[PDB]
Structures are given as C-alpha cells and as structure tokens.
Amino acid sequence: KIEFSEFTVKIKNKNNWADLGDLVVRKEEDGIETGLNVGKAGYTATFFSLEESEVNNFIKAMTEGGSFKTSLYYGYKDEQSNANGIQNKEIITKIEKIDDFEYITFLGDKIKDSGDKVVEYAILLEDLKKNLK
Sorted alphabetically, which keywords does the UniProt record give (predicted)? Predict the structure, then answer.
C-alpha cells in the first residue's frame, strides 16, 4: 500500500552539476506522474509517467538504485524527446556521492543535435527516501 499523494523535490542536471528546478511527483489512479517546474512559473510540463505495474520498481530504484519502465518520457528542453515524447523508456538509477551527499542519479534522453551525448539528472537520496512510502 502506497501512502504518498504528491511531493516536490529539487532536481539537478549536468552543465558540472547545476540546479535545474523542482520535480513534482504525484500518485495517480494508475501509476505515477512526474512534472518539471523550471524558473519563475517559467517552464511547467510532464517529465515522465509510469503505469501501476512499475510503481514498486520506481520506489526501489528511487530509494536504493535500480531500474523502471516509463510509459512516456519527455525530459527537459535540451532532449530530443521533449517535443514528441518517447514511449517505454527504461530509467536506470545509481546512488552517487556529490560533495559528501548521496544522490539518486539517472540518464535522460539524447541531446537534440549531439552525437549520442545524454543528459544526466540528480535528486537528493534523503528527499526521496522520506517521501516514497
């Protein structure tokens, strides 16, 4: 039984690690929807969504490291997937230390006009651990 409803965590990206914005995580009837808020208002859109059957994988991946399948992935402005989405994309997470602090890190999609150069995201592990229940 999932207890969470909606929460917000700060999200970082690669330039060096830099602050990007807020990631809103919502528990829907079927699965989870994540939204990205960048700047002030500013940019506000779906980041990725996943089905009910992938909720347990998502919770384990976002608190321990692992993988989960999204039903739809958009990412941010610099990704190829932003305009039209990518279906069934697998997200692989790792726990990495950034300035003596543990983060959940994952790769996004390819950058718009770059030779398989991919975006990387980071979220504070403690922020996810305390919210995902």
Answer: Plasmid
Residue type, 117: K
The domains found in the chain, sorted by start residue, are 1-133 (2.30.31.50)
Residue 6 is which amino acid?
E
The whole-angstrom separation of Cα 34 and Cα 32 is 7
Cα atoms found within 13 Å of the Cα of residue 27, Cβ hemisphere only: 14
Resolution of the determined structure in angstroms stands at: 2.4
Buried b or exposed e, range 18-57, using 16+ CB within 10 angstroms: eebbebbbeeeeebbbbbbbbeeeeeeeebbbbeeebbeb
By what method was this entry solved? X-ray
Task: Report the half-sphere exposure of 69 (CA within 13 A, side-chain side).
Answer: 7
* Cβ atoms of 55 and 1 closer than 8 Å: no
Structure token pair of residue 80: 């190829």
Pull the structure tokens for residue 133: 């229940």
